[PDB]
Every structure is written in C-alpha cells, then in structure tokens.
Design a protein around this ligand. Structure first.
Ligand SMILES: O=C(O)Cc1c[nH]c2ccccc12
Ligand SMILES: O=C(O)Cc1c[nH]c2ccccc12
Ligand SMILES: O=C(O)Cc1c[nH]c2ccccc12
Ligand code: FES
Ligand code: FES
Ligand code: FES
Ligand SMILES: [Fe+3]
Ligand SMILES: [Fe+3]
Ligand SMILES: [Fe+3]
Lengths: 447, 193, 193, 447, 193, 447
C-alpha cells in the first residue's frame, strides 16, 4: 500500500476505510508515522514525585524507563541494554539511583549514563567509550500540569501547542482547580481491538452512551441515567463537541460533574464541584468555571483518553492491529478530602477498570468493529463519521477550536481522522504541517 | 511454623494466614465449608445471581479483588499505593452489578454466557476472638465461554470470612483475592471469583 | 430456593437440578460419590477403557454430550432443534468406541496419548421416587497431550445418574453434559468426559 | 508470487505444489479468486422455513446473515453495521423482522434496509440518505432443491450450470427421493488443516478408507467393513469417479446405502433404500434409481462436501492456511420415519461429528499434510494425483462428466485442482471460462 | 480388576497402582492425605520453600519427574533409555534448589512470582508390607504467573509415598511424576509439582 | 530487505543490528542461507547403534528420519510422504525395516525407497515409477567421532573441514578420551527466544556467568563458584577464546573438568579427569591432554552447542524469530563407570535441562534480548561485541584459529557473526568462500 496516495480517510474526515482497524502493514506504518512522531502519555508527577522514583511505560510498542532526576527534571530512556539488548528493568515502579543489567552486569544511572562495567579495567582497558553508550533517550519530555508526555521526534511541536484548542477546555480542571493527581497503580487488560476504536469512542462518541450502556445506566443510576435505552435526548444545548489541529478532541456535557459514578457518590460530587465552581466564577469567568464541572470525554491524540469529573484516565497501548493493552488510572482533584479521593478512585475502577461494568458494555463494540476490518468484504468498506457535518464552526467568540454546538455528533471523529490521515501520508512534521494548513476550513466545509 | 526472616520470599500476610489453618484441624468445619463453597459455585455457574446474593452474601460484605503493582523484591523506598481494586464492593454495589447482569438490555449477555467453576484446596478455621466468624480459604479455576470461540480462564486463591446471618445461614462477609496475573489476558475480569 | 421469573438468566432445568442437592445433605453419600468418580477418572486416565465399561458403566446407560445452538436471550419464535449430540451413546455404542481405542490399527493412538482428569465440585443426592437411583453432579477438567506439542483441555459440568447393578456395584446409567464451548478449539471432542 | 504465471497445479491436474496447503499469501489470494468468486453453501430451507427466520453463515472469512423474506425468497447480508462496522448479529439462528446494532442503535430490516436511526430527526435532520445505507448484500443467492448457496460475484454462472455434470449424480437423492432436509444445528470444530485437505479427501479419496479407517471399519462393522486394514479391494465395477468443469466431483460406491453407519442401522437403511429404489426404477430408470441408493462422496467446489446415504454434510470454513472451522450437519430424506431420521442424525455425528470416530482417523492426515506445506524443503515438492490417469473418459452414453470407471482413483482430484488453478490465475469469470475451454480434453489426455 | 492383555493400552505399572487403591478404602486415611497435600500446596504457593522442606519433605526423599520418549505403540526392539529425569532429587539436591530460589541475586524472582496450585483426585492407601508407608495419589494443576503477561500452567498426576518422621510428622519420601507433555510449552519446568 | 547489500553485521563482526533477533523475513531467509546450507546436528551412534534403529530430528524447521542402514551407514530422509504429503513417522525413536504411511498405506524402506503401494497392480498397473518416488533424502550425512550431522546442500565442505580450527580443541575429548556417547532421550522445551541468542551465549559468553548465575553458583557450589556475584575475575591466564572460518567457536576455561556440576560430583570428576589426563600426556602432549580436562563452551555453527566436561549438549531448533525448541542431551565418556555416567546425566539435566536451575537464569536474558529485536526503536540499534578486539591473533604456535588469549571476551561472537553475515549475503557456498577469503585478517584487524 502506497501511504502517500491511498485515501484511508476521505475529505473533511467524513469516512474511513474499515481496513485501518485491521491492516498489519498499516499498523507497522503507524509505529513510524503515529507513535514515533507524536506525544504519548508516560506518567504523572504524583507517581514519581521524588528523585530516583521511576516507572516503566509503553510508547507505541516500545518500553521506556521514566525517571525523576536529582535536579527535579524527568528523563525517559528505552528499557534496553546497550550491550546485548536485554530488557533492563523488569518492574513497573520503584526508586533507584541506577539500573543494573542482569545479563553481564552493566550499570546505568537514573540519568541513562553508562556508569559501571564489571571488571572494566581488566577487560576493556580504556577502549570502551562509555559516554557513547548511554541508554537511548526519549528526545522530548514535557509536562501539562503534572501530566508527563514523551515524544521520540525532536521536531514535534511543544506539548502545549500540540494540545492546540483542546488545552482551553482542559485547563479549568487541570490547572484552575488547584491541580489533579493520578491515582495508581493502573489496571491493565488486553482487548482484541485496534487502538483507534476506543480512541475514537472516547474522543467523540456520546451517541452510543444511551444504547450501549442502557443496562449500566439503569443499574447504577448515574447522573446520565436519563439517556438509558434511548429513553431521552439530552436538551438541545446540553453540550458541544470540539476538535483541533493536531487531532485531540472532546465532547462536553454540561454540568455532569458526578459523571458515570453510581448514585452512592452523586450528592457529594455535585456538592463539591458546585462549590469550587462558585469560587472559580470570580477567577476565570462563568463559562470556564462551568466547563470545570462539566463532563469532558476527550482523546489526546493519538492514544490517551479521559473522562474528566468521572475521573477516568486511559492509555490505549498498541500491540498489533487487533490487540490493545488498556491501562486505566483514576484522576482526582488534589484538594478533595482523602476519603472522597479513595472512593472516587474505587468507583473509576468499578465502572471503567478491568471489571468495569461500563467498560464491559463497550468490549464487543471495540473488538468486533476492529476485527471486521480484517474481513475480505469489509476492508474496502467505509466507516461513516458524518453526523453534524455542515454545522461545525471555527473561531467562535466563546468556544475555541472546530466546534459542534450540540452534545451528540461526530465532529471530533472528523478532527481525529483528519490528523491521522495527515500523519500517515507524511514523512515528517514539516509535511504534516503542510498537509494541515487549511485544517479548520476542511472541517467546516458545508457550513 | 514460618519465620519470614529465613523464608525470605514469604510475606507477613501469607505467613499469618497459614498459622490460622495449622494449629487446629476440624474436618467437620472443613465439610461445612466444602458444601458452602460448592453450593455458591453452583449458583454462580447457573447465573442465579439473585439467589447468590440472598443465600450466600451477607449484608455487611466486603467483596474485594486487587491487582498489585510489580515492584522490585529488594524495593524499600518507593511507598505509593501498592494495589488497585478490581473489585471492592459492599452489598449495595454487588446488587448494582447483579442488576446489570439481569437487565434485558445487557447486550453482552446475548447469547447466554456459560460458566464452569472448579473449587479446590478448601481449608476452614474459626476465628480465635470471634467464635462466630468462619475463615475459609479456597482456590478457584473459573472457565467462561461465549459467542462461539471466546474462552477465558481465571485462576485465584480466595481468603473468605463467613458468618451466620438471617435464619442461621452462613453468608460471605469478606472475600479477598490478590489476582495473580498483573496484565489480564481474558478481555476483562467481569466474573465473580 | 430459585424463582426463575426473578432470576431471569436461570433455566428451568438448572433451577430443578439445584433443588435436588439443597434439600437434603448426606455427606456419606457425598463420600461414596467422590470415591466412585475418582476411581472412574483413574481408570479413564490410564486408558483402561474395558475396565471402565465393566466396572463403571451400566448396561442401560445413556451417555450424552450436547452442543447447543447460540440463540438470542429474548428468542421466542424460532423452534427448530436446539442442540446436536456430540455423544448420545447406549452401552453397545460405547463398546464400539472402546474397541476403536484398543484396535492396534488405530494409528492416532501411536505414540500413546496421555490423559489427566481433575474432578471437582461433587454433589450427591438420592432420587426421591426411585430410592436406588443416585444423582451425582461434578465438574471435570480434562487434559489430553499427544505427539510432542499437542495439548487440549476440556471443561464441563456433568449431570450423572448412578445405580447399583451387577454384584451391587454402582454404575453410571446416565451422563448428561451440555458442552460450554460452542466451537471446539481442541481438534475434536474424542474424549470421555 | 505471480499467480498469473506460477504453476501451482501441473497440466491435467496431475500434481500440485505442496505450498498450496501452507502459503498465507496464497490463502489471501484465495479469498479473492476462490471464495469471493464461487458458490458457497449457506443453509437449507428446513433451517429457515418461515418469514423472519435467519441464520448466520460464513462465506470465506466473511460472516453473513441469511434471512427468509416475507415474499418467500431468501436474501443474505454481510453481518456488519453500515455506521462504525460493529458485528450486527451475535447469535447463530433465530426469527426477527430486523436487526438492531447494539453500538449506536441503528435498526436494519430483514431485507437489509436501514429502517431506523435513533433520534434521526434531531441529529441527522434529513441529510442522512438511508436508502444508500442498507447492509452490504450478497449478490447471488440460489437454491438446489432446498440447499441454499451464495456468491459475492454477480457474474457467476447460475448454481445449476455451476454444478455441471455433478448435478446428474446428485438429483436422484436431492430431487427424485422426494427431497432432503438438513438437520441442525451443526457441530463446529476448528482443525489445524488447510480447507483444501478435507475438500480433496471428500471429492475423490476412496483409496484411504480401508487404511486410514481400518479401526473404525472393524469396530463399527459398517457395510464398507470389508475394506478394513486393506483386507479387500472392492470388486472391479464396485463404483466410479467423476468430475466436472467448475471443480465439483464425487466418488460413487455401488449400493452402499447404509454407508458409514455402524451395524445397528444397516438392516433398516438397506431395507428403506431398496424399497424407494424399486419405486424409482419406473420414474427415472434403473441406472439413476441405483445411483440414488449408492454412496456418493462429493465436494461441491470449493469447500462444501457430503456423503449421501451416510448423510454427512460438511462445510470447510477457511480461517487461515493451516486453520479450518468444520461445520457438520446431517442430511435425511423427508419421507423417512421421524424416529429413523433422529437415529440417522445421531449416527452422522457419532461417526463424523465433533467426536466422530471416523473423523478422528482423518485428523492427523489433514493436519500434517497441511502443515508440511509450510516446511522449507517441502514447499516446492509435488503432491501426486495421477492414479487412474489415462483411463478417464468424457461424454459416456450412461454416466456424464469426466468419468473414471473404477471405484478407487484420483480423477476427482485432477478435476478439482484443474478448476482451482484456473481460478487462481484468473481475474474474473470470463478469464476462468477462457482458461477452461478445453477442460475435459485436458483431463482425458493419455486416454 | 485389570487384565492388561485385554486392556491393551494399560501399562503394567498403571495397572499395579490401581490395584493399590481399590482393595481397601479407608476414608479417614483419605482425609489425612487431603490435609497433608492441601497444606503442602499452601506452603509452596506462598513460596515458603524452607518450611516445605522442614515440614513436608523427608530426609530420605526421592523427588522425581521424568519425560518419556515417544515410541511406537507396537515397538518391541528398540531398548535404549526410555526416559530422562527433569527432576531426580535427594534432600540435599532439593535444598540446593531451595537456596537458589531464596538467593537475593536470583534475578528471575524479581518481581515476585505468583503460584496457585489445584490439588484433586486424592487417593490414599497403606502399603501392605510396610505398615508405616502411606501411598498417596493426587493430580495437580499448577498456575505460575510472572512479569505482567507470562502465564504457564502445568498438569500432572503424582505418585507419592509419605512416612512419619521427626516428631511423628508425615513427610514425603518419594514423589514420581511422568510428565504428560513431551515438549514443554511453559518456558521451563522450574516448579515443584 | 536486500540481503546482498544490507549490513546486518559490521566489519570484523564488531556489532549486529538488533533486528536480526526479531525479523521474520530474515528468519525465512535464514531457512535458505543458514539452515539449508550448513551442517546441522542429527543424532549420535549411541542412539541408533543397530541396523533398523531410527530417530526423528529437526533440520531447521524441517523434520527428518535418520536411519541406521543394514550396511552400517546412516541415511536421513524428509519425514514427508511422496503421495499426498502426510507426516510419515509420528514417534521420536524406534527400530524398523520401513515406514508405512497411515493415509493410503504407502510403504517406504529404511533406505527411503518406495517399496510397496497397496493394490498397486490393480490400480496403478505398471505406470507408477516407484524408483522416482523415494523419500526426499538429506544430501550429506557425516560423522565426527560418533556425532552425526546432516546437510541439505551437496556443495558443503566435508564436516571436518567445516569444523576448521575448532576441531583441534574438540579432539582430545571427542577422540583421544576413547570416545563419547550421547545419553538420551533429550529434554525438550520451547523458549520465546531467537535461536541465535543461546547460540551466541554458548559460543563465547563467559562474561555473563558470574552475574547471570550468581545464585546458581552460590547455591550449587560448582568449581566456578568463585565467579559468583562478580566476586572474582579468574586469574589472567585462566583460559582463552577461539573462533574459525565457518563460524564455530568456543571458550576454554583451564582445568574446569567438573564444570557446572554441584559439589556432590566435584571430587569424583576432578579425580577421573586428572587420571585420564596423565595417561594422555604421553599420547597427545601436555597442552592437548590439559585441553581434554578443560571446560569448553562451544557452538558448532549454526545451532548446536555444548559444554564439554559439564557434558551439556544442546540443539537450538528454530521455529520462528522469537521461538526456539531447545533439545538437551548429556554427553559422557564411554569408559566412565556406569554409575558415574548415570549421575552425570542426571546432573546435566538438573543444571541445564527443562528444570535446569542454571538454564532458568538464562531464560530472561535470551527471551527479552530476542523480543526487543522486534521493538520499533531497537530494530536499527547495534548489539555490541567488541570486547577483546584488537588483541586477537591468528596462526599461534600452540593454539590454532583466531584466538583471544584471555578467558573472558567476545572473540567468538565476532567469528560467529562474521560467518553468519557471509552466508546471509551469499547465494551458495562458492560465494560464502569468496566472502570469507580474508576471514582471519578481518577478525584480527587492530592487533
Ligand atoms: O462510555 C464511554 O465509552 C466513554 C465515553 C465516551 N463518550 C462519552 C460521553 C459521556 C459519558 C461517557 C463517554
Ligand atoms: O472417510 C472420509 O474421509 C469421507 C470419504 C471420502 N471418500 C469416501 C469414500 C467412502 C466412504 C467415505 C469416504
Ligand atoms: O551458562 C551458560 O550459558 C553456558 C555457558 C556459556 N559460556 C560458559 C562458560 C562457562 C560455563 C558455562 C558457560
Ligand atoms: S546485555 Fe546488558 S550487560 Fe550485557
Ligand atoms: S456501529 Fe452500528 S449503530 Fe453505530
Ligand atoms: S499421503 Fe501417504 S500414502 Fe497417501
Ligand atoms: Fe462506552
Ligand atoms: Fe476418512
Ligand atoms: Fe548461562
């Protein structure tokens, strides 16, 4: 397949070839054009707060060690020994000033430097140039209010510019709330789906909630219970959708601060969010303060997703075209009482973790949609994402980005797949930028 | 029995649990326990989840399954949350999950799932301080089959506490499972272990 | 115990079977049953198929394993054959299969197969109406290994009826298995569950 | 591999490259040139007799829904939603006027039309063209006396012409007996073999019966028991082999109406068949009436096989080059007493089902022969199918097709692989026909 | 019971072992055996290998697991070594292996492994000639999980001899396993079956 | 990938691309350029000593039958039937005058000839040319003191020339000791590693012993116990490394006759070896007699490895790029007392068999190093093998081959990968020889 010419995503992101969820050659291509090029979620300050603290993380199919440096910075390195290529670290988290390889005993510092070699003087003499033998380092490591992302490509935009218009929507919760922390360790589960299926589901799919989750809504009696069995459309004006230049996007559902959580947490959450919102009115304005306590279903391109207020935080780690390793953390506001934080963390896993009763509703959706992309008569078929097209705006006076002013639609899919197509047919960031010069014009075309 | 300074791989928790079943053996309590668990497994296997709640689960229950982060055997500094809760349910929360299973719009349950449980290694002992609290340890293999070719098998050790409640029926008041696989390869853990 | 209008996922058949073992517990019948099944599994595991027939299987036996078609939980109109018989054998038919196993020209049996059976969850109760009919329910994991790297594992619940026959030996007069996997991933089901 | 030029099957079908049982690239090619082009078995009238009745079935690696229409016709559709591509139907059989997708709730009728979309007026307005969004329909669905076949290729010959000379042999049992019914549900088992191994085994392999099944013959004492351990050649004149233009073929074993069934069914079967045969003499002639009660081992190209009289009916569903999902039904004559039908159905599964003691004899044959096709030193080796070559005739006054007038031989292999090679090197039906203009001349060359 | 000229697939060894448990059933010896094996499995599962040695393993132990070469069912000429020893350990050799497990530089044990054992099909009988020798047969499923996504499951039948030693504690003096899979698909067999 | 041009191994064998442990295309290429071209270990005289004795063995991914002929020679044949390609022999060892196929009953002799065909006269008449239908025979089968190797390539050098300079080191133990025997059956275990990882580990890795096996050394108290936890460098002069033209190589550790064996065998072994060494002094000289009782860690290119004195004998059978089937035998000296032989055999399996406590230390090393070769950011990385480079000699007056006169180094890696690169970029033996004309000069370049 010629990725320069082949149309995998049609103009305006209106449709995608079903094969993108199943093609192994395209998966391999994605390793280069998607995962080696873009910003990928690693960890949070709260998980490595002290010098020497480290965690392992995936970046695409690669594994990295992410380490808090003595100077307070964070550096990340391929989890691979420079000698004969054994995996260096076999645990998920810890604290250490260095990492020793268990094969021949080479010792690397937390800063990735080759620091000791067993019997170096006797064996290597002086001919081993250790300064050239440091662990292969992740080029770029940046933070968005405590959330740490990495990028193998030195030429990438800074993380803030990369979040583009999505940053405006995230800031009330990520910044003005006083800050979030990530509660680990994450749940970890392999699903037989392409990483793009849950990515697209979280970036813009409010449509499925009432139907896919009819039973969970009815059973848990969450604030969204109204939508169950498709019993109710949320009022015209119940929210909006947005998307951005570099692919990130989200749905907004007004005032849904208790989110997916079952009735046992609803009064406390609604009281707590409303209280902070009243304080925030004076600091950031009524619109943004409301955004803070509104439910955002977001994907940070390409494979990091989240539900603010619900507190769900996801990493869709790619394994092959029909295999994904799902990591699930909880996000909580730092100034929440500790007991509330703990119950919120548990509830995030209860609904969306390895035994999450909502996450289970989605399973067959993600798996079969992905697996059908391998079936012969479906490969060249078109997945449709035209809902709301011709009504999207750009440059609105109140809400930034390409915006659909309705709670349910496919605006964010179109934005996600536009960026995806732009990367797949590009050899570097310069070419992506060239292919993205009229991005919002393309997304708003019939409007 | 165990000294965990000598038996360097044994946790304090694990050594405590073994002391519980070693001191006194009462094979009649062991038989009550075997029957209790066999009947519970039978009800769960036929998906009589309401019956399970009514007959096997106490109102004060904590039903908990954790996944523990992989840390270095020599680790001793890093002190952040060691585990997350795959389950950590009170009776009301179990009830929500049972309602979810029985809902006619739970699409995932059509066609009907098939469960087969294998319970082994049952041990039972009364608590020393509360003479109405029964400790039962048992291991489960749980086989779940659905939709033609999906087959998932779960393996776990269960630390239970059972207590006589309504009408003198012994019911589960605590289940603790530390799930042995860190990354699940069974699509999800949506089964009652 | 069970009301299948409330416990919406439970079949009438499954609810009937549970009532059988709940009403009366006799742990001595349970012990006879455990021994009976352990010895049967031992004979089958060492491939003493003739001994199995002679010692464990009654002349009036129905040995049946079904595979049930996947239908919608809400289905209520479609009324064609629900299941096919993977096995539905009388004694003579079992004998044919045993002869087939022992034949020196059964090429599939060279090199010799290896079987290991794990029997769990045994329950036993006498029939209320025929006081010589023993109902035994048990679950099996059956591991079959052959030719270096072929490994197949079967999982099933067994509904048995056992009755005293020749010389007062209890023998199997009915086995019913509803096999839990619709599409077999074990090359075949050519094993005595 | 260049499939236009590469000789996978030599002239006259005398030999095949062993790699055809193992090559994954060729498997993918087969999805296009074999399974997307030819007639594939779906179901029987007896399984979907009422309006609204449906079953799922495989066509190649694709899954379809096959539905009885209100007008009495049958239409088949890809089991894939037109929105985001989730599998529509997750059961194997049922009755319904439509199928609702559990992802976003789109409702399709039994006729494949997109009939409802949740909150269509609020969300899509009028801009959703539902008449363009019907399920992707199987182009061709035709019946051969109740047996329903499908074909994705509109250009295929009608099913009757496609059966060619094989139809003549099938008709006494399929048509003149008063009709057959298929007894479901089928047994379903995955074997580690190429779909072509059991296809070729059923199309023309009487040779293996005495040896492969020595133990089953001796144990069950079926009417073929004579052949056990190679103790006996059936008399010269015990039967014949035939093959046809489009690949279908069969062996005929004279008078073997009780077939593979063990001695407990032999007297009843032989009495029942002989009785109908006497009536049929007057209607269709002595030769054909005898054909009715003679054992036919047949493959309908490419992957549907059967043993008439025995009542074995097989679908070899392809998964990959060394994986096949075997479906096993029973066929019975409609005017058989119900109790006989039931015992015949059970006996079909007893011998050839998931625990079939005959089917188990064949397992290692099919699996290892298929797996050896991946081994480096065997890929370019030649599988031989020359038995009986130079003695085949065409246009005989009594028996139509290319015919070997002996019970045991490889005439049907040659015919099967000639058609297979013709398709693999062709881009469409026109090219197959061009490559098949001298088909019977090629098969009879040394004669 | 068995005649191995008629039951053509049964080995002389296997037929001998079955005769041992058939003649006399003593369900109290069976209960001692169940407890013995359950406690042994518990100690091994929590990796109390020192405790296992001290409490479960006799000083005169032979701990043996073989892998038998695949030969033709009709073979009768070829007479070279039929099997190799995956294990064939005396107490001192078991001790070396236990030391190896507990060593802080056994890199393979970080992060800590997780073991879950399932013991089934227990049979027990006293030796006829040595009235202090207990024969116990049992089957094990052993589940080992490590490093996130490594999962290995072992299946075996165990022929044990247990004898009262220090302080009257019954300890293992012989374990024999003929491992049923010829080619291991579990990375290694580095587990105590 | 163009294997003629692509540099997978840099000049002098100093480094290798990590992808060689993970690339499936390269694996397939290796089947042709490595395994179909070179000498592969089959069995030993001791395992098939009588006419009619046979074993099965792998050669690459192919399976062969290896049979003692009536005339005392050994011939080997593909384990594949000439008819429809079923696997002929399903056992691992036995005695027979022939092999009958269980599909259609074709009978082949131990000499590979097609000897009988069931009902040949009735069916084939005289038209079956049986002399053309013998089993596909392994071109070359040669012995090195009882150890039997095979080669599919008729153009290969004789086995002795192929062992090159390594033969000199093996002969004291293989020849002058009075001969070895192989104790079967072998243990058999699948590991998730490339075949090259344990190949390279055995050919030249003494470096890892002290660190990888710290725990086994400390626990078993073997003669190498000194090295544990990196507590000790062996004295300067404790041994050497060598390599050769065709890739074979080994490390030598002076006087370590008891090898890996735990303390319970140490006194007996050291007494026995020293005793034979004293006799050998007079026959072969002091240097070679000492070599006899010195520990050799050797790989015979490509995938046969061994530890003399320890008695470990390994076959790394390739399955795919990250899968290897490990066969483990014991080697013992024929004139050892039988009881010593038995305990040595058991100890070989205790340390290096399926539950070998040493072999388990190595597992994660081999598996992760191999699996990292598939990871995107590591594929183009360089595995380093420069230890000892610039100090290797050739043509020394006492020790033949390219020799590093130090116990620990990577001389043998460089020699192994030089030969590997030479084959991978060559189409035949003539081209390998052309690419190897300055082999020792390339290996000694900075010296
Ligand atoms: O249920 C999900 O899949 C997560 C999700 C995506 N969009 C949503 C809108 C509201 C609530 C949850 C979600
Ligand atoms: O046994 C089979 O594989 C089916 C089959 C193929 N040709 C046959 C001829 C007679 C009877 C059965 C078969
Ligand atoms: O431990 C191994 O992997 C085998 C091995 C390779 N080189 C060695 C040197 C000394 C002892 C053992 C080995
Ligand atoms: S591979 Fe890490 S020190 Fe050698
Ligand atoms: S995928 Fe079917 S309705 Fe959306
Ligand atoms: S395949 Fe061997 S005789 Fe036919
Ligand atoms: Fe969802
Ligand atoms: Fe057959
Ligand atoms: Fe090692």
């Amino acid at each position: 397949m010629n990725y320069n010419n082949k149309i995998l995503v049609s103009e305006s992101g209106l449709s995608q070839k079903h094969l993108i969820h199943g093609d192994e050659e395209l998966f391999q291509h994605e390793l280069k054009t998607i995962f080696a090029r873009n910003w990928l979620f690693l960890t949070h300050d709260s998980l490595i707060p002290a010098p020497g603290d480290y965690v392992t993380a995936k970046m695409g199919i690669d594994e990295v060690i992410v380490s808090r440096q003595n100077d307070g910075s964070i550096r990340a390195f391929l989890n691979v020994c420079r000698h004969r290529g054994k995996t260096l670290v076999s645990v998920e988290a810890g604290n250490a000033k260095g990492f020793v390889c268990s094969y021949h005993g080479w010792g690397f510092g937390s800063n990735g430097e080759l620091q000791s070699v067993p019997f170096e003087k006797d064996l290597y003499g002086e001919s081993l140039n250790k300064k050239c033998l440091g662990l292969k380092e992740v080029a770029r490591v940046e933070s968005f209010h405590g959330f740490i992302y990495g990028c193998f490509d030195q030429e990438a935009p800074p993380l803030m510019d990369y979040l583009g218009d999505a940053a405006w929507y995230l800031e009330p919760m990520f910044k003005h709330s006083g800050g979030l922390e990530l509660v680990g360790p994450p749940g970890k589960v392999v699903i037989k789906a392409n990483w793009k299926a849950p990515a697209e589901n979280f970036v813009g799919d409010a449509y499925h909630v009432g139907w896919t989750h009819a039973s969970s809504l009815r059973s848990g009696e969450s604030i969204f219970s109204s939508l169950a069995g498709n019993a109710a459309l949320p009022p015209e004006g119940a929210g909006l959708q947005m998307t951005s230049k570099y692919g990130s996007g989200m749905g907004v559902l007004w005032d849904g601060y208790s989110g997916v959580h079952s009735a046992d947490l609803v009064p406390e959450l609604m009281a707590f969010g409303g209280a902070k919102q009243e304080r925030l009115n004076k600091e950031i304005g009524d619109v943004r303060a409301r955004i803070y306590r509104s439910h955002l279903n977001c994907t940070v391109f390409p494979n990091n997703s989240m539900l603010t207020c619900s507190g769900v935080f996801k990493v869709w780690n790619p394994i092959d075209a029909n295999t994904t390793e799902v990591w699930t953390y909880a996000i909580v506001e730092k100034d929440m009482p500790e007991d509330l934080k703990r119950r919120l963390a548990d509830s995030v896993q209860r609904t969306f973790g390895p035994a999450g009763f909502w996450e289970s509703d989605d399973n067959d959706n993600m798996e079969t949609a992905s697996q059908n992309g391998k079936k012969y008569q479906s490969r060249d078929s078109d997945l449709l994402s035209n809902l709301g097209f011709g009504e999207d705006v750009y440059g609105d006076a109140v809400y930034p980005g390409v915006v659909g002013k309705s709670a349910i639609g496919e605006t964010s899919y179109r934005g996600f797949y536009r960026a995806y197509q732009a990367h797949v047919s590009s050899s570097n960031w310069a070419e992506f930028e060239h292919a993205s010069s009229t991005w919002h014009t393309e997304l708003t075309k019939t409007t | 029995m165990i000294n965990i300074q000598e038996d360097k791989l044994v946790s304090a928790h694990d050594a405590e649990e073994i002391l519980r079943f070693f001191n006194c053996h009462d094979s009649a309590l062991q038989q009550e326990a075997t029957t209790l668990l066999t009947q519970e497994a039978h009800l769960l296997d036929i998906q009589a989840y309401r019956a399970w709640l009514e007959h096997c689960v106490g109102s004060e229950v904590q039903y908990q399954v954790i996944s523990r982060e992989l840390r270095a055997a020599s680790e001793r500094r890093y002190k952040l949350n060691e585990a997350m809760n795959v389950y950590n349910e009170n009776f009301q929360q179990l009830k929500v999950r049972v309602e979810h299973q029985l809902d006619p719009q739970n699409w995932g349950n059509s066609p009907k799932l098939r469960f087969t449980r294998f319970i082994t290694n049952v041990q039972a002992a009364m608590d020393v301080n509360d003479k109405e609290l029964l400790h039962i340890r048992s291991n489960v293999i749980l086989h779940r089959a659905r939709r033609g070719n999906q087959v998932d098998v779960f393996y776990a050790a269960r630390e239970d506490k059972w207590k006589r409640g309504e009408g003198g029926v012994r019911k589960l008041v605590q289940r603790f499972v530390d799930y042995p696989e860190r990354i699940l390869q069974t699509h999800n853990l949506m089964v009652f272990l």
